Amino acid sequence: MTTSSRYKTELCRTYSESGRCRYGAKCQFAHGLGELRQAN
Numbered sequence: 001m002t003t004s005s006r007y008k009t010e011l012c013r014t015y016s017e018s019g020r021c022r023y024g025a026k027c028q029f030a031h032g033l034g035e036l037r038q039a040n
């Protein structure tokens with residue numbers, strides 16, 4: 001069963017290198033590629 005929602009499916013890829021960080025300081029997913037649940 002696990003969580004019945006869970007956050008997004010993205011990940012701090014190149015972002016973590018001070019790039020963009022769609023959620024600077026608050027990033028957990030939404031960022032560069034982030035296609036865990038779309039190719040992984």
Ligand SMILES: [Zn+2]
Nearest residue numbers: 012015021027
């Ligand atoms: Zn980030």
